[PDB]
Amino acid sequence: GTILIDLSPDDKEFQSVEEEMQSTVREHRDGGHAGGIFNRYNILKIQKVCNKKLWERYTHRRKEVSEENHNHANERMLFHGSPFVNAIIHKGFDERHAYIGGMFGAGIYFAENSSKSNQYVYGIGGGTGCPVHKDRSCYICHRQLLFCRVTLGKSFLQFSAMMAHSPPGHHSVTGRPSVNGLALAEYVIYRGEQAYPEYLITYQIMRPE
């Protein structure tokens, strides 16, 4: 069902996605261990992910959520990094894509910081790095992130020092940073239907000069 349509770099939609990718890079407390050392990315391709079935799966759930939340889906655009990216874009998000050991329980995790999702591209803690060089900080191998439309609904605020169910009466969990000054928020949904994998970004991390 899925088709991938390339966006021209001249297209304002390309530029706005690249800008969110680039401007949400931060330094991480692991000093680059999981995701590599970089301040910016070389964006190689942005593709729009088009799947009618999956989109309708998403908009149905979004409607259910907003109807439970005074007509407010609380929709965000958030990054997602995973070794299952290629599965996700064909079959949609489901329980196989959950971070089982996550600080907010077994759910599917999204980030405001692109560099945060970048840590999971090769797996939990960056795994053993790129399959070709076994290097978590590879500057050569091509990486992929998703920029996703996500329905938060009523989100449970977890103040935090940084498949299951949502907490009763909520539709998601918000991981609010309570120590790392510059960290952006992280979010968890417990229904895969509450996200749609809208953009596939192919990129490299870049070596600082």
Ligand X SMILES: Nc1cccc2c(=O)[nH]c(-c3ccc(Cl)cc3)cc12
Q: Is position 130 annotated in a ligand binding site?
A: yes
Contacted by 93, from ligand X, Zn ion, none: CB < 5 to 8 Å by type:
none
- Interaction between residue 138 and Zn ion (CB under 5 A): yes
Type and span of the H or E element at 67: helix 52-67
What is the rounded distance in angstroms from the CA atom of residue 94 to the CA atom of residue 79?
16
Shortest CB 43 distance to ligand X, Å: 18
- DSSP conformational letter for 160: E
DSSP for 44-99? EEEEEEE-HHHHHHHHHHHHHHHHTTTT---EEEEEE--TTHHHHHHH---GGG-B
Shortest CB 201 distance to ligand X, Å: 12
Instruction: Give me the residues paired with residue 42 across strands.
Output: 204
Contacted by 102, from ligand X, Zn ion, none: CB < 5 to 8 Å by type:
ligand X
Contacted by 130, from ligand X, Zn ion, none: CB < 5 to 8 Å by type:
Zn ion
* Residues at the site binding ligand X, with contacts judged by CB under 6 A: 79-82, 99, 102, 109-111, 116-117, 120, 124, 186
Q: Is position 141 annotated in a ligand binding site?
A: yes
Give the CA count within 13 Å in the CB-facing half-sphere of 157: 4
Q: Is position 148 annotated in a ligand binding site?
A: no
Shortest CB 89 distance to Zn ion, Å: 22
Contacted by 105, from Zn ion, ligand X, none: CB < 5 to 8 Å by type:
none
- Interaction between residue 183 and Zn ion (CB under 5 A): no
| Encoded tokens for 17 | 């996605």
Q: Is position 80 annotated in a ligand binding site?
A: no
What is the rounded distance in angstroms from the CA atom of residue 42 to the CA atom of residue 35?
15
Provide the annotated binding site for Zn(2+).
Answer: 130, 133, 138, 141
